[PDB]
Amino acid sequence: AYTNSFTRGVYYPDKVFRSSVLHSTQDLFLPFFSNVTWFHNPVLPFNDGVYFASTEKSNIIRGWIFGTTLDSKTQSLLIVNNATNVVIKVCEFQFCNDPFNNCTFEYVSFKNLREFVFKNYFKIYSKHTPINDLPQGFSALEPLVDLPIGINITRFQTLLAAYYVGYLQPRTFLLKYNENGTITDAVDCALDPLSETKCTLKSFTVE
Amino acid sequence: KGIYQTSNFRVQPTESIVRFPNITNLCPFGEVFNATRFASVYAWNRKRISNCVADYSVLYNSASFSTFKCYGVSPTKLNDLCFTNVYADSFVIRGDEVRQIAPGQTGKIADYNYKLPDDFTGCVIAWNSNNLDNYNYLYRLFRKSNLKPFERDISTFPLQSYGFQPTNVGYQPYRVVVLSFELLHAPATVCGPKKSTNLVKNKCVNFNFNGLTGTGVLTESNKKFLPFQQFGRDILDITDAVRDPQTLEILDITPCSFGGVSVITPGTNTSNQVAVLYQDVNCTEVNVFQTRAGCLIGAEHVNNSYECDIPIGAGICASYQTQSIIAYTMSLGAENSVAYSNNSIAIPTNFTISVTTEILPVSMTKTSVDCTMYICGDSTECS
Amino acid sequence: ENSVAYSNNSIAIPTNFTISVTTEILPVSMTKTSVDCTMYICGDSTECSNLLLQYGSFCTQLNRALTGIAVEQDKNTQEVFAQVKQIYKTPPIKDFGGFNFSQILPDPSKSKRSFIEDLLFNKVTYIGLTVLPPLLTDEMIAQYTSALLAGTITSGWTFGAGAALQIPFAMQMAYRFNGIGVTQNVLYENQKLIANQFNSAIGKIQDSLSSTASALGKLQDVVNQNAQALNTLVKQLSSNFGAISSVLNDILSRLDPPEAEVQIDRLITGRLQSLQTYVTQQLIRAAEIRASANLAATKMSECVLGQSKRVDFCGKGYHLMSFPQSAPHGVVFLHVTYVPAQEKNFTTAPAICHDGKAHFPREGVFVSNGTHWFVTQRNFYEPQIITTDNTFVSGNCDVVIGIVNNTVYDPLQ
Amino acid sequence: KLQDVVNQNAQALNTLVKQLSSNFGAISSVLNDILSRLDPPEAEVQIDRLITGRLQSLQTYVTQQLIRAAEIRASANLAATKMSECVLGQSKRVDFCGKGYHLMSFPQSAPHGVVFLHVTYVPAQEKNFTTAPAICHDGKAHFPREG
Amino acid sequence: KLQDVVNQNAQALNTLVKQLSSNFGAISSVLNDILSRLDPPEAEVQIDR
């Protein structure tokens, strides 16, 4: 099952304020109008970074596991958002075949769609907007945590009903920061020859 | 007679201001440089260091280090810098091999055990350990390709051991530490021990926030930073605002008042009195007059208008007259309402056969330059 | 395509005309930019300035070159607009024979610009890079154009040639017609129609300038080329050039002088080559704008202060007169041109026979409606009965190829 | 106009000769001192800084001269045009031939230039008259031919 | 005149292409030879010439 993620998954590239300006930036991003895999348990590739979104009714999805083989003899990131504490750690877990020691890091901190952008050292962005299945609308993601862990990672799994997975790719985006210093639009410079023109002219309007 | 741009004026900084975050815990460098065990180079150890204060003078002042070679900072500057991550890498190698631990080298160490980037920004710190540390220390010989910068590789036969017995000088075990400073544009977390000092507003000052140096007038601003943003950039990509690291307030940075200075003079055969124009500044930042070109000192303003003499700009001209220099809005010429009506004509009854000189350049002085004799005059070794 | 309906004996003569106002736009000056080469290359830094002195005059020569361009922008603007030795004014009574200049004369309710100048001024849109002001502010430019207007309207060309002399505006336009070989009776016998065509054509200038931003493209191009040159010049400050950073104050925070000088000399080398590129681009662009200022001054000398006989120099038509409007860093000419409009085909002959002697037209052409022979002006159909007053004798019939036998009236007979 | 063209050429050559004294980051700007002091393998590192600097200074001077020669050629073509139209003829181009109605011009030679004495009819003593576009004699209107 | 304009454009392109043979103080003007003969750290100093 696939869904067209229209213009979602733009995030602030750097911890720098800018306003009323069209900054052009190269980073891993979710490509515009990409197919996102709509799940309803399965261990997935990560490749470059995962955009993840859910219209979770009652906090049904709660967490993630990331690594290479999700067993001992390698390290694996765990995240659990248990409403008491955002538990994070990178232990060499001997996990089960389908879950729902030697630890080297630890940390604590319907209408809504939760969004995240997991990328590598390890960074998480977030946004949390009401809607009424991804919206034909636009909103930036803000950094949420930025945690140094030094982990080789290529696979992930999810802990618990819809969740949408998209894979990031290296791209150049042009981002319109408004007067309040928030991104109101973006252009994916790889999308089509019009977008290649919009980035060439550094403009959303091409004469 | 004329106006001459002579020099740039620039208001000087009144104070030095350093702001670093209010952290007081000394970094765990003793737990690296004085550690009892150092790892075998093929599986070189990494410890990251953050959220602490690092006195590099405690390292650098010791002669116990045989080398302290730094490749993107000079060691006397370290205590005034601040960094995101330090990344201390630690291992043992043969003493005569220590010269391979540098940006851009080739050899059994730099190609297959531990590679630094060709733009490594850090310090390599090394010492003899024959008084302490033997086949127990290992290195790689063979690989299918060279390893990437800061790659680490455990695999299986391609490993060998060193012969570090106490009777062996280049054959001795040298302990090596590399510090690999992350100069990233982010909230920094390892500063040198240099003291913070009180905030100063609306005065020109030499500022340093988290190691970002400059000079400017700090002013508190209504720029709506999101909680994660550390500093802001202008439309010209220069730093335009910053957040104070010891209290989260958004300070705009304005560069201290500057401008071209131009001197307005009659001919020196006529007088030595002159008037000074400070271009593009209000008359507060410097018998004083004000113009859209800048603040004008020593020329008196006049309500009459005359033909232009020395042009200032923005409709103002200056002259020397009954004496002082005066500045005035220039006359475009005498006013004349023409005596038009729907049945009036004026016809010349008499004429003048005036002669009027016009001068034009027609040629340049025909120069030829011998490019070989200009560049390499009388020299085979240069030619 | 058009096959023109030619023959050895067919001529097309226009029975009616259109007065058309064309707009012609020219740039006249650049922004008077002056870039402080020491602050651009070595911003606030002694340790950098002491290296830039190793390159000698390569700072001073760039201030010398940009000062040369900056004075030339006032020289260009002076040579285009300041061609009038006095500031003329129009009378309170606007009795200009029906021509309605109220769209282009100053409005006293307003800087004292005209109506069409406000369309023009609305339609065009920190680190050593200072901008100097023009010598003439836009109010003073708008007062020289008011003097050129009040000269041209009340006094024709004569305010360029000598003292300004009043002449009634209908009698000026009768000379403007006489200067294109259209006889004065073609003006007064059509005066209200000519005034209405001028007033309507002036009306279309407002709608043309108001409707599209593209009309001022030449001036917005000159603004944009300068803004792209400064955006380039400032983006080049952020380039590494092969140094460890572009932030000069950081290099000096990180390195001791024996090391720092090897890095800073790469930024000085790159920024200096960037500045020499920008100053070269500006010198070539200043030569282009000088050629446009000399062209604008030439059009204002010949086409405003006179009536240029130079075909298509003053917009597409037989030229009458021009009204200059100020525009931001430029000038605009409303060229007013007679364009002929409603031709009829006539039979023609190069000469006519009457008594074996041949007669030729003094001014004009011979034509026939198909049954009677007439002589006419060559740029407006007006048949005169042929006489020894409109025609002169030469030779005899036998030499002229295509002559026709005819009768010529003798006014004395 | 002529004196400033001579001054601009003199300033350009004086700048070009002064740049031979500039270090450009070598140990000396006197080329023979470098060659007196050093063996070729080390001297090449110094001399190539002077070659890079002097060549950039020559490329600057030649670019300045090419741009200046386009201004002097535009001036020569304008002088040739005034000599074609204003000396060899009588121009009807208002204010092309000095401020007046044009009669004739006499050229004079001058150092690296030309001078025209333009001779012009400028009218001087006007009187005000009542005027009319035409006059009526016999129900017919009459208009002036050459007046 | 036209033959001079065609000649100047051809001479400018010929000069620009001959400048690819020039060393500018590098050990060779052949970019693939400095890349195949030199260690990457030394190669950057030759390529940057």
UniProtKB/Swiss-Prot annotation, chain A:
Effect listed in the UniProt record for changing residue 98 to Y: In strain: Gamma/P.1
Effect the entry attributes to changing residue 43 to A: In strain: Omicron/XBB.1.5, Omicron/EG.5.1
Assembly information from the UniProt record: Binds to host ACE2. RBD also interacts with the N-linked glycan on 'Asn-90' of ACE2. Cleavage of S generates a polybasic C-terminal sequence on S1 that binds to host Neuropilin-1 (NRP1) and Neuropilin-2 (NRP2) receptors. Interacts with host integrin alpha-5/beta-1 (ITGA5:ITGB1) and with ACE2 in complex with integrin alpha-5/beta-1 (ITGA5:ITGB1). May interact via cytoplasmic c-terminus with M protein. May interact (via N-terminus) with host bilirubin and biliverdin, thereby preventing antibody binding to the SARS-CoV-2 spike NTD via an allosteric mechanism.
Purpose of the protein: Attaches the virion to the cell membrane by interacting with host receptor, initiating the infection. The major receptor is host ACE2. When S2/S2' has been cleaved, binding to the receptor triggers direct fusion at the cell membrane. When S2/S2' has not been cleaved, binding to the receptor results in internalization of the virus by endocytosis using host TFRC and GRM2 and leading to fusion of the virion membrane with the host endosomal membrane. Alternatively, may use NRP1/NRP2 and integrin as entry receptors.
Cystine pairings recorded for this chain: 91-103, 189-199
Consequence of substituting residue 62 to I: In strain: A23.1
Glycosylation sites: 35, 82, 102, 152, 180
Organism from which the protein derives: Severe acute respiratory syndrome coronavirus 2
Record's protein name: Spike protein S1
Coverage span on the entire protein: 27 to 309 of 1273
